[PDB]
Write a protein that binds this ligand. Structure first.
Ligand code: CLA
Ligand code: CLA
Ligand code: CLA
Ligand code: CLA
Ligand code: CLA
Ligand code: CLA
Ligand code: CLA
Ligand code: CLA
Ligand code: CLA
Ligand SMILES: CC1=C(C#C/C(C)=C/C=C/C(C)=C/C=C/C=C(C)/C=C/C=C(C)/C=C/[C@@]23O[C@]2(C)C[C@@H](O)CC3(C)C)C(C)(C)C[C@H](O)C1
Lengths: 220, 217, 37, 222, 62, 166, 69
C-alpha cells in the first residue's frame, strides 16, 4: 500500500541484524561489525594452525560465489515466511500424530485406523478427522513452503547472475514486486516458445507449462 | 503518634466530623484522612496500605540517593561528571562511563541496556517473591512487614516498640514522598539543582520563591 | 423506546460502534501526527 | 411536583431513549438523571463523598465564574482602569509597581506582598473549611452541605417541596458553572485571550471563530 | 455410597465429554442390576447437543 | 552514525533522489491545471507534506540502504547503543501495554459474567455499564497480572481442565 | 418460521417494500454524488475529452493519489 500510494520511504524495512552478525562472525566484512573471523585481533582469527582461513576469507568476500550472500530487508521478510510455513506444516503433522489415537470428538480413533473417511455427519460432522487427513492437509502446506523457498532462491540468484541485485533488493519487499518483476517478467520467453510465427526449442517447456496448469486445475 | 479511638487526627482539635468510619485507628499513620473514600472497600485498603509503604520506602532511599552525590561533590572534592540527579543518567550515554565515587576502577559501566535488563530481571524475581510473601529469604510474617533476614537486629521482637516504629516509618515515608515530589517539580520549574534551590532561598528569603517563576506562566 | 437500548447493547451493534470510534480515533491521529515510522 | 426530578418517574439523561437508571442511582438525590457511565459511584461511601464534593466544587465554581467574568466586564464595557483585567494574567499584578488596587483605584487595597495574602488565606480559609466539616462559631455541623441556621437568613429552605426543587436548582446551576469554568481554562489555553474577547470573536464571525477553526489552525501549524 | 440428589460430582470416565468437569446429580437408581445408575446434568452441552448422562459410582468423585 | 554498512538518510544521495522523483511527478501533474485552481492547491498540499516527511526522516537519525530507503534496527542492544530505540523497542513496550490492557479487560468481563444465571446471554448482549467500568478500571493491569501470577489464581489446576484420552 | 401461508405472504410483501427503500436510498446517493462531487457540468460541455467522475477521496494516509486527473 505504501508502494501503491507513491511513498516507498514509508515502508517498514527491518534489517536482519542477527543474520548479519552471524555472517560477520564467519568473515564477511560488508557489514563493518569486526567480530571473530572478521576481526584481525580475535583468537578465532589468529589461531596459528587455522590455514583454511585465507582460502575461506577469499571465498566469503567474493560477490560471484554464493558463499553467504549479502542480505537485507527482503531477506528478512521471506525468512519469516518460510518460518511460518515450517511451523504450520509441523502443526498440521504434529496434531495428526498426537491426535491419532483419539480426541474429544472421537475418543476411539485407534479402533478405526490410520485412514478412514470420517465418522459420519453426527456430533456436528466429522469430515477429515483421521490422521491420514492431517497428512493430506499438510502436503499443501509443504508444497507452499518449498514454493516460497525456491522462488526466493531463484529470484535471488537470477538477479545476482544478471548483475542487478538492486532489482531484488528493491522489489522483494512488497508482493506486487514478486508478481511483476519475478513471475510476470520471467515468463516472457517461456510463453513465446510456440507462437503464430513459429517455434523454438522452448516449445517443449511451454507445453509442459500449460500441462502443469491443466493437471493442477484438474485436481480441484 | 498513637492508635485507638482518640489518636492525633488530620484536622487536629477540629476533627469531629472529619474522620470516616472505616478508619478505626488500627493501622499506623491513621489520622482519619480519606476524603475521596478510596479505602472504603477493605481489600482495596489492604492494597493501598502496601502501596503507601512501597512508595514511601522507595521515596526515602530515593531522596537520600538524589542528594548524596551532590553533597559528596560539594563538601568533599569527589569529581562527579554531572552530579545533579536529573543529569546523572546521561553520563552512560554517548561513550561515557559510570564510575562509582568517580573512580574508573569501580563499576565502569557503559552499556545502558545491559544495566536496565539486569535491573528488570532482578526486580522481576524479587518483586514476585515480595508479592507471594514467600521466597528464598523466607516466608513473610506480614506482606508489608516481612521480618526475618529483613530485620537482622530484632527490633520487631518487642510488640509496643514495633507498634511505635510503624508510626515512625509511615511518617518519615510520607515526608520523603513529599520531598521527592518536591524534587521533581523543582527540577521541572527552576531547572537547577535542589541544593542550589535551597542555597538560593537561604541567601534570600524574599523574591527567590515559586513566586518568581509563577509570573512566567 | 423501552427495549431499544438492549438492542443497541447486542454484539454486532456494539462492535460496529466500537470499531467506528477506534477507527475514527486512529484516522484523526493520522491526520494530526502523520508518517510515524 | 417533585416527581420529574425524584423517584422512579424522573427525567433521565438519554431523554426518550432512556429505558431505566443504574441501581446505585435510585433517584433520592438532586439532579439525578441516572448518569454514571464509568460507574464511579457503585460503592455507597464514595457516592456520599462525591455528592458533597460535587456540591462544593459547584459552589466554588459559581463564585469563580462570576469573579472571572466581571472585572473583564467592567474594564471593557464600562471602562474601569484595571491594569490586567484578564483572569489568568491577574495575580502577577501583585508584582507590579502599583499593586493590586480594587476597581483600579490606587488607595483601595494596594497589596504588594504575596506572603501576606498567602498567610491570611491559609489562616482564614483554613478555619472556614475546618468549621464547615467539624462545626464552628456559626453553628453545628449536622448537615455537611445544607446547614441552614446562619446560612439561610431569608428562610427560603422551609417549604419542603420548594427546598427539594431549589436543591435541584442549586446542583444544576453548579454544573453549568463547572462547565463554564472548564471552558475558561481550555479557552485560555487555546486562544491566549480573555473570555469576553472570545465571546466577541464568536459574535463577530460565528462560523470563522470556534473550536473547529481552532483545530484547523493547529493542523495548519502541524 | 451414592451421591445425594442435588450434589455435585466430577466425572472421571476418560471417554466422556465432561471428563474432569463438574455436574449436578439428578437421580440415583438403587437396583444392583443397573450398570450406570447415577444421572448427572451438566451446563455445557457436548458435541451431540445433550447435557445429561448416566454414570457409575466408580466414575465419579464426590 | 553509519552502522551495518548503512548510510544515515540525512547524508544519503539516494534519499534525495527519491524525494526528487516524488516531487517531479507532482510537478508534472500540476502542469495540466491553472496556478490558482483548487486541484493545483491540492497538489501543492501534497508536495508540502512530502517534503516535510522527508525532512522529518532526515532529522531522526534514520538509516538508509543502497535503495535510499530507511531501515529499522531491531536488536535492542544495537538500537539503544546507536539511538534507534524509537523504531522497534519503544513500540514493543507500547504494544505490550495495550495488548495486556485489552486482554485484562476481556478476561475480567468474562470472569464477572460467569457467575450469573445465564452467563451466555451476557456474551451476545453486552452489559455495557459493566464493560465500561471494566475498561476504565483496567489501566493498571500489571497489578492484577502479577498478583494472579504470584498468588496462583492465574492458572486453573490440571485436575479441573477437560482433556482427551491421552 | 410459520406454517401459515397468509403470515408468509404478509412478510414477503413487507420485505419487498424494504428492498425498494434501500434501492431508493442507493439511487438518491448516485444523484447526490452526481450533484455535489462530480464533473457533470464540465462533462456536459465536452463529452469527448472530459472523463466522468463522481467519487472524490479524502486526503489521509496518502490516499489522495486516487484523485486522478
Ligand atoms: C488546626 C487546624 C488544622 C487545619 C485547618 C489542618 C489542615 C490540614 N492538615 Mg492537619 N493537623 C492538625 C491541624 C490542622 N490541620 C493538627 C493539630 C495535627 C497534629 C499535629 C495535624 C496533623 C496532620 C497530618 C499528619 C496531616 C495533616 C494534613 C492536613 C491537610 C490535609 C490536606 C487538605 O488539603 O485538606 C490540611 C491542610 C495532611 C497533609 O499534610 O496533606 C497535604 C497530613 O498528612 N494534618
Ligand atoms: C533508590 C535508591 C538508589 C538508586 C536506584 C541509586 C542509583 C545510583 N546511585 Mg545512589 N545512593 C543511594 C540510593 C540510590 N542510588 C543512597 C541511599 C546512597 C547513600 C548510601 C547513595 C550513594 C551513592 C554514591 C556515593 C554513588 C551513588 C551512585 C549511583 C549510581 C550508580 C550506582 C551503581 O553503580 O551501582 C553500584 C553497584 C552495586 C552496589 C552492586 C546510580 C544512579 C554513583 C554515582 O555515580 O551517582 C551519580 C555513586 O558514586 N549512590
Ligand atoms: C531473594 C532475594 C531478595 C532480594 C535481593 C530482595 C531485595 C529487596 N527487598 Mg525483598 N523480598 C524477598 C526477596 C528478596 N528481596 C522475599 C523472599 C520476601 C518475603 C516474601 C521479600 C519481601 C520484601 C518486602 C515487603 C520489602 C522487600 C524490600 C527489598 C528491598 C530492601 C530490603 C531491605 O530493607 O534490607 C534490610 C537491611 C531490596 C531491594 C523492601 C523494599 O524494596 O522497599 C524499598 C520492602 O518493602 N522485600
Ligand atoms: C500488521 C502489521 C502492521 C504494522 C506493524 C504496521 C505499522 C504501521 N503502519 Mg501499517 N498497514 C498495515 C499493517 C501494519 N502496519 C495494513 C494491513 C495496512 C493496509 C490497510 C497498512 C496500511 C498503512 C497505511 C496507509 C499507513 C500505515 C501506517 C503505519 C504506521 C502507523 C503510524 C501510526 O498511526 O501510529 C500512531 C498510533 C498510535 C500511537 C496508537 C495510539 C493508541 C493509544 C492512544 C496509545 C496508548 C499508549 C499508552 C506503523 C509503522 C502509517 C504510516 O504513516 O506509516 C509510516 C500509514 O500512513 N499502515
Ligand atoms: C443559583 C445558585 C444557587 C441556588 C439555586 C442555591 C440554592 C440553595 N442554597 Mg446555595 N449556594 C450557592 C448558590 C445557590 N444556592 C453559592 C454560590 C454558595 C456559596 C456562596 C451557596 C452556599 C450555600 C450554603 C452554605 C447554604 C446554601 C443553601 C441553599 C438552599 C437554601 C437557600 C436558597 O434558597 O438559595 C437560593 C439562591 C438564590 C435565590 C440565588 C441568589 C442570587 C445571588 C444573591 C446573586 C448575587 C451573588 C453575589 C454576587 C455573590 C457574592 C457573595 C437552596 C437549596 C442553604 C441550605 O440549604 O440550608 C438548609 C445553605 O445552608 N447555599
Ligand atoms: C533473539 C535473539 C537475539 C540475538 C541473536 C541478538 C544478537 C546480538 N545482540 Mg541482542 N538482545 C536481545 C536479543 C538478541 N540479540 C534481547 C532479547 C536483549 C534484551 C532486551 C538484547 C540486548 C542486547 C544488549 C544489551 C547487547 C546486545 C548485543 C547483540 C549482539 C551481540 C554481540 C556480542 O555478543 O558482543 C548480537 C547482534 C550487543 C551489541 O553489540 O549491541 C550494540 C549488546 O551490547 N543485545
Ligand atoms: C478475553 C479475550 C481473550 C484473551 C484474554 C485471549 C488470550 C489468548 N488467546 Mg484467544 N481468542 C479470543 C479471545 C481471547 N483470547 C477470541 C475472541 C478468539 C476467536 C477469534 C480467540 C481465538 C484464539 C486462537 C485461535 C488462539 C488464541 C490464543 C490465545 C492465547 C495466546 C495469545 C493469542 O494468541 O492472541 C490471539 C488472539 C486472537 C487471535 C483473538 C483476538 C482477541 C481479541 C482481539 C480480544 C478479545 C475481544 C473481546 C470481544 C473483548 C471483549 C471485552 C469487553 C466486553 C470488556 C491467549 C491465552 C492462541 C493460543 O491458544 O495460545 C496458546 C491461539 O491459537 N485465541
Ligand atoms: C397499477 C397498479 C399497480 C402498480 C403500478 C403496481 C406496482 C408494483 N407492485 Mg403491484 N399490485 C397491484 C397493482 C399495482 N402494482 C395489485 C392490484 C395487486 C393485488 C392483486 C398487486 C400485488 C403486488 C404484490 C404482492 C407486490 C406488488 C409489487 C409491485 C412493485 C414491483 C416492483 C417494481 O417494479 O417497482 C417499480 C417502482 C415504481 C414504478 C414506483 C412506484 C411508485 C408508486 C407506488 C406508483 C403509484 C402511481 C401514481 C399514483 C402515479 C411495483 C411497485 C411488489 C412489491 O415490490 O411490493 C412492495 C410485490 O411484492 N404488487
Ligand atoms: C447508497 C450508497 C452510498 C455510498 C456507498 C456513499 C459513499 C460515500 N459517501 Mg455518500 N451519500 C449518499 C449515499 C451513499 N454514499 C446519500 C443518499 C446522501 C444524501 C444523504 C449522501 C451524502 C453524502 C455527503 C454529503 C458526503 C457523502 C460522502 C460519501 C463518501 C464518504 C462516506 C464516509 O466515509 O463517512 C462515514 C460516515 C460515518 C461513519 C457516519 C456519519 C463515500 C464514498 C462524503 C464525500 O463524498 O466526501 C467527499 C460526503 O461528504 N455522501
Ligand atoms: C491519601 C489520600 C490522598 C493523597 C495523597 C498524596 C498527597 C499522595 C502523594 C504521593 C507522592 C508524592 C508519592 C511520591 C513517591 C515517590 C517515589 C516512589 C520516589 C522514588 C525515587 C527513587 C526510588 C529514585 C530516585 C532516583 O532515580 C532518580 C529519580 C534519579 C537518579 O539519578 C537517582 C535515583 C536513582 C536515586 C488524596 C488523593 C489527596 C485523598 C484521598 O482520599 C486520601
Amino acid at each position: 500500500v505504501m508502494q501503491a500510494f507513491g511513498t516507498p520511504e514509508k515502508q517498514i524495512l527491518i534489517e536482519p541484524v542477527f543474520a548479519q552478525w552471524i555472517q560477520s562472525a564467519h568473515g564477511k566484512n560488508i557489514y563493518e561489525l569486526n567480530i571473530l573471523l572478521s576481526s584481525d585481533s580475535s583468537n578465532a582469527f589468529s589461531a596459528s594452525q587455522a590455514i583454511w582461513l585465507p582460502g575461506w576469507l577469499n571465498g566469503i568476500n567474493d560477490k560471484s560465489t554464493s558463499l553467504f550472500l549479502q542480505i537485507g530487508p527482503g531477506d528478512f521478510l521471506v525468512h519469516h515466511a518460510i518460518a511460518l510455513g515450517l511451523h504450520t506444516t509441523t502443526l498440521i503433522l504434529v496434531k495428526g500424530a498426537l491426535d491419532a489415537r483419539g480426541s474429544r470428538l472421537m475418543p476411539d480413533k485407534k479402533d478405526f485406523g490410520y485412514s478412514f473417511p470420517c465418522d459420519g455427519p453426527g456430533r456436528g460432522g466429522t469430515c477429515d478427522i483421521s490422521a491420514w487427513d492431517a497428512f493430506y492437509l499438510a502436503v499443501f502446506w509443504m508444497l507452499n513452503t518449498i514454493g516460497w523457498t525456491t522462488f526466493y532462491w531463484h529470484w535471488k540468484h537470477i538477479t545476482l547472475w544478471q548483475g542487478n541485485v538492486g532489482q531484488f533488493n528493491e522489489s522483494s519487499t512488497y508482493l506486487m514486486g514478486w508478481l511483476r518483476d519475478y513471475l510476470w517478467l520471467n515468463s516472457s520467453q517461456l510463453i513465446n516458445g510456440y507462437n503464430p510465427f513459429g517455434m523454438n526449442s522452448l516449445a517443449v517447456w511451454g507445453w509442459m507449462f500449460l500441462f502443469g496448469h491443466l493437471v493442477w486445475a484438474t485436481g480441484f | 503518634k498513637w492508635y485507638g479511638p482518640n489518636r492525633p487526627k488530620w484536622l487536629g482539635p477540629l476533627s469531629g466530623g472529619a474522620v470516616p468510619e472505616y478508619l478505626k485507628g488500627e493501622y499506623a499513620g491513621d489520622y482519619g484522612f480519606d476524603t475521596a473514600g478510596l479505602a472504603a472497600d477493605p481489600k482495596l485498603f489492604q492494597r493501598y496500605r502496601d502501596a503507601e509503604l512501597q512508595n514511601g520506602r522507595w521515596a526515602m532511599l530515593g531522596v537520600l540517593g538524589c542528594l548524596a552525590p551532590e553533597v559528596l561533590s560539594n563538601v568533599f572534592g569527589v569529581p562527579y561528571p554531572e552530579p545533579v540527579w536529573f543529569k546523572t543518567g546521561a553520563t552512560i550515554l554517548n561513550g561515557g562511563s559510570i564510575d562509582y565515587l568517580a573512580n574508573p576502577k569501580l563499576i565502569h559501566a557503559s552499556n545502558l541496556l545491559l544495566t536496565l535488563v539486569l535491573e528488570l530481571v532482578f526486580f522481576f524475581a524479587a518483586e514476585t517473591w515480595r508479592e507471594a510473601g514467600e521466597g528464598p529469604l523466607g516466608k513473610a510474617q506480614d506482606k508489608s512487614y516481612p521480618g526475618g533476614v529483613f530485620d537482622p537486629l530484632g527490633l520487631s521482637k518487642d510488640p509496643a516498640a514495633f507498634a511505635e516504629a510503624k508510626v515512625k516509618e509511615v511518617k518519615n515515608g510520607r515526608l520523603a514522598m513529599l520531598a521527592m515530589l518536591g524534587l521533581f517539580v523543582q527540577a521541572g520549574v527552576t531547572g537547577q539543582s535542589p541544593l542550589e534551590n535551597l542555597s538560593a532561598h537561604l541567601a534570600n528569603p524574599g523574591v527567590n520563591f515559586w513566586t518568581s517563576y509563577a509570573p512566567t506562566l | 423506546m423501552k427495549y431499544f437500548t438492549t438492542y443497541l447493547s447486542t454484539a454486532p451493534v456494539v462492535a460496529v460502534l466500537w470499531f467506528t470510534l477506534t477507527a475514527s480515533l486512529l484516522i484523526e491521529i493520522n491526520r494530526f501526527f502523520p508518517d510515524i515510522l | 411536583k417533585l416527581s420529574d426530578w425524584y423517584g422512579p418517574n424522573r427525567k433521565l439523561f438519554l431523554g426518550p431513549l432512556s429505558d431505566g437508571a443504574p441501581e446505585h442511582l435510585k433517584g433520592e438525590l438532586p439532579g439525578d438523571y441516572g448518569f454514571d457511565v464509568l460507574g464511579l459511584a457503585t460503592q455507597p461511601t464514595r457516592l456520599e463523598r462525591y455528592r458533597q464534593g460535587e456540591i462544593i466544587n459547584g459552589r466554588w465554581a459559581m463564585l469563580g465564574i462570576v469573579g472571572c467574568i466581571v472585572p473583564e466586564l467592567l474594564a471593557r464595557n464600562y471602562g474601569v482602569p484595571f491594569p490586567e483585567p484578564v483572569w489568568f494574567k491577574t495575580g502577577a499584578t501583585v508584582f507590579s509597581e502599583e499593586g493590586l488596587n480594587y476597581l483600579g483605584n490606587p488607595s483601595l487595597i494596594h497589596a504588594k506582598s504575596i506572603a501576606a495574602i498567602l498567610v491570611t488565606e491559609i489562616l482564614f480559609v483554613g478555619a472556614a473549611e475546618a468549621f464547615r466539616v467539624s462545626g464552628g462559631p456559626l453553628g453545628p455541623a449536622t448537615d455537611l452541605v445544607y446547614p441552614g441556621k446562619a446560612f439561610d437568613p431569608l428562610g427560603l429552605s422551609k417549604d419542603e417541596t420548594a427546598f427539594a426543587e431549589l436543591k435541584v436548582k442549586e446542583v444544576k446551576n453548579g454544573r453549568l458553572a463547572m462547565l463554564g469554568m472548564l471552558g475558561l481554562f481550555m479557552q485560555g489555553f487555546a486562544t491566549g485571550k480573555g473570555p469576553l474577547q472570545n465571546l466577541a470573536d464568536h459574535l463577530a464571525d460565528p462560523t470563522g471563530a470556534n473550536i473547529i477553526t481552532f483545530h484547523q489552525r493547529v493542523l495548519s501549524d502541524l | 455410597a451414592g451421591p445425594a440428589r442435588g450434589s455435585t460430582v466430577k466425572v472421571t470416565r476418560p471417554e466422556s465429554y465432561w471428563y474432569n468437569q463438574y455436574g449436578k446429580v439428578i437421580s440415583v437408581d438403587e437396583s444392583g442390576a443397573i450398570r450406570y445408575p447415577v444421572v448427572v446434568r451438566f451446563e455445557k452441552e457436548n458435541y451431540q447437543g445433550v447435557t445429561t448422562n448416566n454414570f457409575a459410582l466408580d466414575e465419579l468423585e464426590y | 552514525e553509519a552502522i551495518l554498512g548503512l548510510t544515515p538518510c540525512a547524508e544519503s544521495a539516494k534519499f534525495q533522489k527519491v524525494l526528487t522523483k516524488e516531487v517531479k511527478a507532482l510537478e508534472k501533474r500540476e502542469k495540466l491545471y491553472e496556478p490558482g485552481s483548487a486541484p493545483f492547491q491540492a497538489l501543492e498540499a501534497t508536495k508540502a507534506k512530502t517534503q516535510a516527511r522527508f525532512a522529518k526522516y532526515a532529522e531522526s537519525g534514520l538509516l538508509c540502504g543502497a535503495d535510499g530507503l530507511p531501515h529499522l534496527i531491531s536488536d535492542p542492544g544495537l538500537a539503544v547503543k546507536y539511538g534507534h530505540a524509537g523504531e522497534t523497542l519503544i513500540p514493543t513496550i507500547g504494544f505490550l501495554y495495550v495488548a495486556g490492557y485489552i486482554g485484562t479487560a476481556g478476561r475480567t468481563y468474562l470472569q464477572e459474567i460467569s457467575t450469573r444465571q445465564k452467563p451466555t446471554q451476557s456474551e451476545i448482549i453486552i452489559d455495557v455499564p459493566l464493560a465500561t467500568s471494566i475498561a476504565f478500571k483496567s489501566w493498571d493491569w500489571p497489578n492484577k497480572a502479577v498478583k494472579e501470577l504470584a498468588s496462583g489464581t492465574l492458572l486453573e489446576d490440571a485436575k479441573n481442565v477437560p482433556v482427551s484420552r491421552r | 418460521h410459520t406454517t401459515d401461508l397468509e403470515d408468509i405472504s404478509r412478510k414477503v410483501f413487507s420485505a419487498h417494500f424494504g428492498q425498494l427503500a434501500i434501492i431508493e436510498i442507493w439511487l438518491s446517493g448516485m444523484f447526490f454524488h452526481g450533484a455535489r462531487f462530480s464533473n457533470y457540468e464540465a462533462w456536459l460541455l465536452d463529452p469527448i475529452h472530459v472523463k466522468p467522475s463522481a467519487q472524490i477521496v479524502w486526503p489521509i494516509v496518502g490516499q489522495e493519489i486516487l484523485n486522478g486527473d
